Structure 1
Amino acid sequence: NLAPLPPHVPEHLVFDFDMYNPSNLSAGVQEAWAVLQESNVPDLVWTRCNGGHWIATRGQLIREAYEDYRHFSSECPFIPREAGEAYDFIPTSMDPPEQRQFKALANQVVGMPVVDKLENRIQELACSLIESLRPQGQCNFTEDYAEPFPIRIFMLLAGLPEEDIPHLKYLTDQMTRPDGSMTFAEAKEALYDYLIPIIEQRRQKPGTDAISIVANGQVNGRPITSDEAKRMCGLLLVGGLDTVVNFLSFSMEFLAKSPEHRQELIERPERIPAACEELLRRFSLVADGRILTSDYEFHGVQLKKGDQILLPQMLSGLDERENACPMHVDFSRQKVSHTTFGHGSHLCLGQHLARREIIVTLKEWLTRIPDFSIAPGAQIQHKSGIVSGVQALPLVWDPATTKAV
């Protein structure tokens, strides 16, 4: 389904890439997206899929566009346009200076001090989850750890019932990896229907949870409104349920295939932090964009007001001009360059929480289950979207080789 080429788009700048169903998906989602970085592809292209939009294929441009909010606005960050228009999460749908105020409050509920406070709990859940799987000798990583671990920690932070996970997770997934079952506006509607009552109650009888903190916060000297609280909370929800979840599978899929990398971390644990960054670079998984606020010429290409442009955060670290041998995982890289957590005034607020959950998982898993692999006959399938993911990850191991700690 290709849309007719706009009058201002040069025919030679056309490359029909479908961010929701890339061609070589079978080889891995990152590999599938990296085709945009082949010699035959210009730095800035236009695809006719999903309504027609631009795509910046180089780290340099991606960074530039993200730094220039004057021309590239957050107002419409999702593709297709229908989704981006219905998109109203705070603070991502807003540009600075406005953005700053809300960013500050959000940082209060998921910032560093909060992570430091939840450390022991994160460590406890990881250990408990793993120890319970260790003797089984097998599991579907995606549903047995990748999902429960980060999500339960979030529900704990938000003070929400673990019984709502299935419902909430489904709605989130429809927003990043659309099933066609429902439009973005509907998924968004459903999620807000869930939050409104809760925020209401949290305004009258406040608690210590992130939701209470947000629902009763102060922005620009005055108090936050219900709508504003609802829109910010909706964003924390999507971030807490559909980000770390997927990243952990990509990483575990790789560690399961690379004994030498597992070994390296087991012997030189001081390398884990560095390893975490390299994996964040190699298995980057986010791709959203911006909207042109006016006609603007970007690197020789003429962009028209209203044009939407995808700035794949995942491509920056795969660009050979930024990292030599991009597809190779090297824990000892002198300089690990990436924009996995974004770039510009919208740099990820939950990156500290994320890194903590990743580093804990790596350390605690390899301690108890140092040797594991992917189940025979299983074919690991990836899925593309605003946030890419793994369908399932069947792992197997000899319990006799595990270590109860």
Structure 2
Amino acid sequence: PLSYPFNEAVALDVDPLYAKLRAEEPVVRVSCPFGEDAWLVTSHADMKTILADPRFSRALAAEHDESRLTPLPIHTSILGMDSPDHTRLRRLLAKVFTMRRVELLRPRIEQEADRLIDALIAEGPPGDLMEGFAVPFAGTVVCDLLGVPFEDREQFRGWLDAFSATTVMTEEEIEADTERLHGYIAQLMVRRRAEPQDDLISAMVKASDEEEKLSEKELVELASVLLIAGHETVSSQLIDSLHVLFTHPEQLRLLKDRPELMPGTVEELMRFVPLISHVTFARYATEDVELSGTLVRAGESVLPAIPSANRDESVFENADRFDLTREHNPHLGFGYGIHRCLGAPLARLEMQVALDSLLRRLPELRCAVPAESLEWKDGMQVRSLLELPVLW
């Protein structure tokens, strides 16, 4: 079977093999960097099936040497569970991670974007939209929400890569950093149990201790993935989105003159940005399933190449084109079905506030270097810039 990934992900370029696979062989057998061989799934319709059809399981992966790009299986907490365990954690989170809580964060989120832009301006151009905006914006928001002290970022931020690194960390470094993060969250939970604050960890501990009993370890592992999602996924998506906007200056001009397009713009960025470097987490078939002419037998794994589903020309017209006016946008950038992104309302809020504020306050914002000089973060499960120098 083809060794997969076929090629290292470069900048935001999509490997042209996905288009060929989608056209000529949408499901193909591959060998993975780690774990068992798998079926690479490339089309939008098959993506929905393996993500939402109950014939495909995440919890089954623990009964295998899970097909994966990471040296060790990731502690994916809720995202590694099936019903009923999944239902138990999803209910817990939905009860404390309410829409009211999110919209109550809006003024704090807006204020953080304005404060970050005040700093960029006071420091003068060129500024770095990654370490000077996307990272601390995403970080302060998730830290505010979760109850992780943003002041501890110096400690915990260097452990987060352990949850995402493919080629650039050893088993031993991943295991050590995973233990460091879990143990840091566990100490936080002791404080938050005794001294609850208005944050998710306190609410989760209270709800778990009182009704929806979770083990300490389950609580730790769930708070940990919430930290990763808010800190890393959000800042990665945001900085990649700014890159897309800078490299499509015509759409950036359109957005600035019709701000009511921002909701559809965020959705189009979710679709178009190939944020996931290759695939999200493998599922395993519990029964035989045919996908685009390929029989996937029970016990075999499928790799969901979500970014390729989001370039499916049979679902999105001119799927290879970034078009922030796109109206039909059933993208899978926030997943689909049972494991669809619980944080999507918040991520959409953050995206909209960040882009609106930047475009509002920095009218002539533009990249300070040619796209060729940019340094990307390689060897992770998502794509991101290390620096995005800008003028204004």
**Shorter-chain TM band:** 0.7 to 0.9
**Using a 3 Å threshold, how does the CA distance of structure 1 residues 324 and 381 change in structure 2: closer, same or farther?**
farther
Structure 2 residue 42 is matched with structure 1 residue 57: yes
Q: Which letter does structure 2 place at the counterpart of 1:127?
A: D
Distance 1:30 1:227 in 2: 39
| Superposition map of 1:349-360 within 5 A | 349-360=342-353
Structure 2 residue 169 is matched with structure 1 residue 175: no
Asked if structure 2 preserves the Cα contact closer than 8 Å seen for 1:78 and 1:288, the reply is no
**Using a 3 Å threshold, how does the CA distance of structure 1 residues 98 and 160 change in structure 2: closer, same or farther?**
closer
Deviates more, 1:187-196 or 1:74-83: 74-83
Asked if structure 2 preserves the Cα contact closer than 8 Å seen for 1:71 and 1:296, the reply is no
Partner residue, 1:134 = 121
2:72 to 80, 83, 90: 83
Partner residue, 2:284 = 292
For residue 334 of structure 1, report the CA deviation from its aligned partner. 3.1
Distance 2:387 2:39 in 1: 31
Distance 1:49 1:250 in 2: 26
Partner residue, 2:29 = 46
Structure 1 unmatched runs, 5+ = 1-13, 398-405
Distance 1:141 1:197 in 2: 32
**Using a 3 Å threshold, how does the CA distance of structure 1 residues 47 and 293 change in structure 2: closer, same or farther?**
closer
Partner residue, 2:101 = 114
Structure 2 unmatched runs, 5+ = none
For residue 48 of structure 1, report the CA deviation from its aligned partner. 2.2
Partner residue, 1:145 = 133
| Superposition map of 1:258-337 within 5 A | 258-286=248-276, 287-294=279-286, 296-299=288-291, 300-337=293-330
For residue 317 of structure 1, report the CA deviation from its aligned partner. 1.4
Deviates more, 1:296-305 or 1:336-345: 296-305
Aligned to 1:243, what secondary structure does the other structure show? helix
Aligned to 1:99, what secondary structure does the other structure show? helix
Distance 1:133 1:169 in 2: 22
Partner residue, 1:7 = none
Q: Percent identity?
A: 24
Distance 1:396 1:178 in 2: 33
What's the C-alpha RMSD, in Å, of the aligned pairs?
2.5
Structure 2 residue 231 is matched with structure 1 residue 244: no
For residue 386 of structure 1, report the CA deviation from its aligned partner. 2.5
For residue 64 of structure 1, report the CA deviation from its aligned partner. 0.7
**Using a 3 Å threshold, how does the CA distance of structure 1 residues 71 and 161 change in structure 2: closer, same or farther?**
closer
Q: Which letter does structure 2 place at the counterpart of 1:173?
A: D
For residue 349 of structure 1, report the CA deviation from its aligned partner. 0.6
Aligned to 2:316, what secondary structure does the other structure show? coil
For residue 203 of structure 1, report the CA deviation from its aligned partner. 2.2
TM-score with structure 2 length normalisation? 0.88
Structure 2 residue 355 is matched with structure 1 residue 362: yes
Q: Which letter does structure 2 place at the counterpart of 1:43?
A: P
Distance 1:216 1:57 in 2: 42
Asked if structure 2 preserves the Cα contact closer than 8 Å seen for 1:15 and 1:47, the reply is yes
Q: Which letter does structure 2 place at the counterpart of 1:114?
A: R
For residue 282 of structure 1, report the CA deviation from its aligned partner. 0.5
Distance 2:251 2:289 in 1: 45
